[PDB]
Design a protein around this nucleic acid. Structure first.
Lengths: 192, 217, 203, 105, 56
RNA sequence: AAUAAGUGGGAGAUAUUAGACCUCGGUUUGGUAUCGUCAAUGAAAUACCACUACUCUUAUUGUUUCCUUACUUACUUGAUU
RNA sequence: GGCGAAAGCGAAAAUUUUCAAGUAAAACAUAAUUU
RNA sequence: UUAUAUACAACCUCAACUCAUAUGGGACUACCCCCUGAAUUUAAGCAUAUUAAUUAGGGGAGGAAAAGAAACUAACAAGGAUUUUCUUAGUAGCGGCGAGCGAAAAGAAAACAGUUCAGCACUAAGUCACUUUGUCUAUAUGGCAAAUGUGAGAUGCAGUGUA
């Protein structure tokens, strides 16, 4: 009987919406490997004599990992939390919804912790963040937050009060179903 | 089983005291019959819950007082309109009737002299254990200074042996901002009459003569 | 950060969440071999606080330890001699069960030094733990001037000489009064020096 | 090695041998709390100085020495000495005398 | 994470039901007459933390 | 007035009605009213109005040395390549 | 696989992923197979 | 994409390798660290006690080890890591209160040295290990770069910081 802090996992943002989320997040892949060098190898040579601070244009990308994100929620800075559900053990992530339900920030739970790792170019990443409010994707940003607010956030305050669970299956299940498929045929003739 | 103005369950906070004036749904004036359920306060013992709650704003209980005077009661008490009698009304207060539309137990709080206490339970007492309006010796009955306060809402209350209370303390027709300083100081003067008190009762009760009982934390 | 949260969350063990997460984690860690390599630490916050980092190679193992007081292994046939010694079935070790865990690891993996351990789960016939080891010849630990001190020789087999954290427990070392006997260094070196006959040259 | 005032009622006066100099006494005496250790003042930051007068007893001890504590310069320009480089020890003392006495009771 | 069953079974002793026997139970469980004292104030607080916030 | 739970507040409430006023009920004023505060007089002065709670009552999600029957996922043994 | 603080073990083990002894055998872990 | 109908790509968990490179198992015994643990004896008997928290021990180290920078003392006019010696002291206490055992604070001296983590805030992984190409010299389980060549690493490495 898996206790209703689980399910929060694995009610995990059905894939009509989640494909649109990963279409958003690809622009916020964190840092290219080579272009990190290409950012700083031209600072080192060309902008050594330039010494500019203004044209930096800090790309506003995902923050990764829980201790970054759990900072970023208690500082109210994140606009979107993605937490995976395949976490081992669980406590790296387990409290994170009941933060975002308390701090108010809209969180989503997305299937795959390897899928999160692929866009941040590590093996596994378990939690992303979104501080980015640039207008080039703000239009998709609003409706994709209006999905997760009723899917998770406005759903969270009655997520916790529900767990049925302990499903038997299949042999022990269909036998007691086969109790009613025959014993009601004694109830079909007695009350008949 | 509760009404709209007399809150039963709701332990209302410090800002919802302003609705205590809303018990006046009648037009005639009603006497606020206070009551409380006491745990570990036995009235059969010497703990007789009887005192005086001197409150700053007077709700004017309609109280007639006969003042037995022997050169000590009515000499100073002309500033508060004492009756100025020489204790001769006690000769007719029992065993007979005074006039039409009048009883023989005709007060709310009795104040007696110190030198004529012997006739209070003997000739007057059989007319008062049948009445329950017996003057004590601790209900501020001396008339040295205790007559300016007597028309200034001196409530003398006697105890029932069935663990119910109903005694006039005032009215509810006036604004609860006047009762903001009244109920905050009366309940400090009621708990002084209690013994070893921190919290022996969970919740309080208050009730008018024509209204349902209010309750308040 | 998250690490303070999962600190506080592991503490609430009698709850409904953390009574299932330790119920499943037992009947995962029972159908395996008693000494066993885990990749990752189970509790990565108490892998921290105890000296683990996420660099190669900090190694972890899970041990089960058969859980109960020690029956004096006497041949069916008596602990002979005086009735003071006649006790068989209520004897209790002077070592832990956690220290007895680290031993059976560190005995077995002779070329890796032990750092600490932690409790991970238990059920009723097997208390069982999670030991942190460190190869002391990997270069990423030899280069490391924060972890380098375990590479010295004076730490060979550092808990078969009692010197981890959960080894120093059972000695009895501390200060002062309550730990007075024994204040010679360790615990046996106190009765050496209490009993010492000083045969001074100039009596 | 600072103190006076060994603890109990027997030795109200005969010293426990002063480990401390307890950072208020450094801060109360013109140094240089981290700096005092680099001279050799023995700064040991476990004592929670409980008296005015015990704090003064060592502050004036920290003023007696540091007034006789000669100072070698580093680069021999010596802009803030405070003592000298012609009281460099060859000129003035060079002693390394033996006891550093306690003024003893 | 929810409560604990020595507290969840002493909250039920603490609704009305003679919180001396709550104290005699936590000191039996926790168990030390200040830990039991300092646990009874918490569950007194939580039972009055639902006084109107959990109306609906 | 009995049979005032009782016993004290109270020394009249409440209701009705038209009038006053309001968009209106209503409250008030007075008339009237089952009693009664009053009188009827005694053990409670019964009206007006109660907190309390049982004789108990229906009903509510109660832990329980409960108990009984089942369930399987822990655990246990047996069987096969 | 186990056990024991260890050393070590009145071990016809009876559980230890392939815990196999294996074959000039095809694809998309050579096939019925050996505890 | 998972009627156990094929494939792909990840990840987790786990295998195998005469894979490339590494550690591990000494034996000594005086000292040292952890265990485990008698009985002879003494009590003029004897059973707790005593031997002795010791022989036998019995696993693990070093040139010393262990300890060690207060969850300490104390009650003062306050002390200040550990270890060792002197004294406290054969004392407080333990004990068939019997035989017997038995410490520490303070004082004196030897020597004296301090510190690092984890964890809120520290707000661009700033991080390591090899890998090949040079360079630097050496028998460097190296340095400087380079490809940013794998890999580790956000389930967090680094800097700053510590009761």
């Amino acid at each position: 009987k898996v206790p209703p802090p689980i399910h929060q996992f694995s009610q995990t943002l059905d894939k009509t919406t989640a494909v649109k989320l990963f279409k958003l997040l690809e622009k916020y892949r964190p840092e290219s490997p080579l272009a990190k060098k290409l950012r700083l190898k031209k600072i080192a040579e060309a902008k050594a004599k330039g010494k500019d601070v203004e044209p930096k244009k800090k790309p506003s990308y995902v923050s990764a990992g829980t201790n970054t994100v759990t900072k970023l929620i208690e500082q109210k800075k994140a606009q979107l939390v993605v937490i995976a559900h395949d976490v081992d053990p669980l406590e790296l992530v387990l409290f994170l919804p009941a933060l975002c339900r308390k701090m108010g920030v809209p969180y989503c739970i997305v299937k795959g912790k390897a899928r999160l790792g692929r866009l941040v170019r590590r093996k596994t990443c378990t939690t992303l963040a979104l501080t980015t409010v640039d207008n080039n994707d703000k239009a998709n940003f609003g409706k994709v937050l209006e999905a997760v607010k009723t899917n998770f956030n406005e759903r969270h305050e009655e997520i916790r009060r529900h767990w049925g669970g302990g499903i038997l299956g299949s042999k022990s299940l269909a036998r007691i179903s086969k109790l009613e498929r025959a014993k009601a045929r004694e109830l079909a003739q007695k009350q008949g | 089983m509760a009404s709209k103005v007399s809150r039963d369950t709701l332990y209302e906070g410090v800002n919802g005291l302003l609705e205590a004036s809303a018990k006046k749904k009648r037009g005639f004036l009603e006497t606020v019959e206070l009551q409380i359920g006491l745990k570990n306060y036995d009235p059969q013992k010497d703990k007789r819950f009887s005192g005086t709650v001197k409150l700053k704003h007077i709700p004017r209980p309609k109280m007639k007082v006969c003042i037995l005077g022997d050169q000590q009661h009515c000499d100073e008490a002309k500033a508060n309109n004492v009756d100025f009698m020489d204790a001769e009304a006690l000769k007719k207060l029992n065993k007979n009737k005074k006039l039409v539309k009048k009883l023989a137990k005709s007060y709310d709080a009795f104040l007696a002299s110190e030198s004529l206490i012997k006739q209070i339970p003997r000739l007057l007492g059989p007319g008062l254990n049948k009445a329950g309006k017996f003057p004590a010796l601790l209900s501020h009955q001396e008339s040295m200074i205790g007559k300016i306060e007597e028309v200034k809402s001196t409530i003398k209350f006697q105890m029932k042996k069935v663990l119910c209370l109903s005694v006039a303390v005032g009215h509810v027709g006036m604004k609860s901002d006047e009762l903001a300083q009244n109920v905050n100081l009366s309940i400090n003067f009621l708990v002084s009459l209690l013994k070893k008190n921190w919290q022996n009762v969970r919740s309080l009760h208050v009730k008018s003569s024509m209204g349902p009982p209010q309750r308040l934390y | 950060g998250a690490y303070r949260y999962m600190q506080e969350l592991y503490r609430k063990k009698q709850s409904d969440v953390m009574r299932y997460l330790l119920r499943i984690r037992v009947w995962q860690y029972r159908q395996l071999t008693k000494l066993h390599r885990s990749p990752r630490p189970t509790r990565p916050d108490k892998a921290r606080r105890l000296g683990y980092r996420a660099k190669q190679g900090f190694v972890i193992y899970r041990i089960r330890v058969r859980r109960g007081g020690r029956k004096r292994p006497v041949p069916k046939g008596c602990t002979y001699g005086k009735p003071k010694s006649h006790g068989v079935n209520q004897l209790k070790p002077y070592r832990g069960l956690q220290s007895i865990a680290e031993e059976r690891v560190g005995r077995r993996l002779g070329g890796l030094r032990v750092l600490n351990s932690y409790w991970i789960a238990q059920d009723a016939s097997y208390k069982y733990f999670e030991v942190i080891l460190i190869d002391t010849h990997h270069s990423a630990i030899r280069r490391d001037p924060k972890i380098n001190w375990i590479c010295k020789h004076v730490h060979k087999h550092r808990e078969l000489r009692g010197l981890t954290s959960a080894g120093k427990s059972s000695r009895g070392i501390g200060k002062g009064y309550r730990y007075s006997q024994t204040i010679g260094g360790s615990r046996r070196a106190a009765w050496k020096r209490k009993n010492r006959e000083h045969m001074h040259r100039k009596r | 090695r600072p103190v006076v005032r060994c603890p109990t009622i027997r030795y109200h006066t005969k010293l426990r041998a002063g480990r401390g100099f307890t950072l208020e006494e450094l801060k109360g005496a013109g140094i240089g709390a981290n700096f005092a250790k680099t001279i050799g003042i023995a700064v040991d930051r476990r004592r929670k100085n409980k008296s005015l007068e015990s704090r003064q007893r060592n502050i004036q001890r920290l003023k007696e020495y540091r007034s006789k504590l000669i100072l070698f310069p580093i680069n021999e320009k010596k802009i803030r000495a405070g003592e000298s480089s012609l009281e460099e020890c060859k000129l003035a003392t060079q002693l390394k005398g033996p006891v550093l006495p306690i003024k003893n009771e | 994470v929810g409560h604990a069953p020595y507290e969840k079974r002493t909250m039920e002793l603490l609704k009305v039901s003679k919180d001396k026997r709550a104290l005699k139970f936590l000191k039996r469980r926790l168990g030390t007459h200040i830990r039991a004292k300092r646990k009874r104030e918490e569950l007194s607080n939580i039972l009055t933390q639902l006084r109107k916030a959990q109306t609906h």
